[PDB]
Amino acid sequence: GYMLGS
């Protein structure tokens, strides 16, 4: 799984 933001 993955979670990211910018």
Chain breaks in the chain (C to N over 2.5 A) after: none
Q: Report the amino acid identity of residue 6.
A: S
* Chain centre to alpha carbon of residue 5: 5
CA–CA distance, 6 with 4 (Å, rounded to integer)? 7
Q: Got the DSSP string for 1-6? A: ------
